[PDB]
């Protein structure tokens with residue numbers, strides 16, 4: 405699948421990202437519309453993240469899911485590594501959230517459902533994501549969630565990772581709690597002005613609800629944000645939550 409830059413007409417800047425920029429592109433021969441992520445080798449080598457890249461690629465070979473952004477391939481020159489990506493035409497969840505400033509229960513419960521399907525899949529293939537947050541979420545052509553990475557900024561991290569203790573896949577369930585809160589409220593539950601205070605707030609699981617968050621929503625979030633990883637629900641228990649089943653379209 406020997407690709408090169410000449411195989412693509414590059415288009416509109418989609419934005420700055422990890423270690424470089426993403427652009428819209430069309431493949432000359434098929435006219436297929438994609439995103440092209442330019443990674444500068446200088447930043448990757450000077451960050452020492454060749455391993456995470458190799459992992460990403462390897463995971464992308466074996467794993468595919470409708471709520472996980474596809475990587476079709478990659479190629480090199482002297483300077484840059486180029487990632488050829490599934491194009492997500494409704495953009496980032498972060499952009500949507502800034503616009504609406506927060507999401508209704510229907511939109512949240514749906515998003516949470518799609519994400520739980522993504523993770524539930526991921527976990528069975530022995531993959532813990534560890535990096536779900538609104539900045540890492542895109543939207544496909546029908547408004548469906550797309551996780552940008554396969555993964556591996558304290559706000560979304562659970563106590564066990566904050567402190568450096570042993571952690572498993574319950575990590576991602578914490579993150580889903582955080583995400584669920586932020587979707588409804590418009591900011592993450594442990595937000596603070598310094599790194600140091602945010603750490604303290606997470607250590608001690610200090611979150612409060614605004615009055616407009618409903619009893620069903622508090623129930624699911626309260627259950628995901630337990631200090632004890634083993635007290636956090638299974639992904640199926642999320643998918644079968646009465647607040648989820650009520651509000652979700654998917």
Ligand SMILES: COc1ccc(NC(=O)Nc2ccc3c(c2)C(=O)N([C@@H](C)CO)C[C@H](C)[C@H](CN(C)Cc2ccc4c(c2)OCO4)O3)cc1
Pocket residue numbers: 418419420421422423426439441448453454456457458460489490491492493495496539540541542552553
């Ligand atoms: C170092 O080893 C790795 C490991 C994984 C990767 N993969 C990777 O970089 N994938 C990727 C794919 C899409 C991305 C990003 C990152 C990225 O850089 N993000 C930022 C914000 C923080 O991680 C995640 C966002 C979802 C970002 C959205 N942006 C920049 C514009 C954009 C808009 C629409 C898009 C699109 C990209 O791709 C398809 O449709 O789009 C790269 C190097």
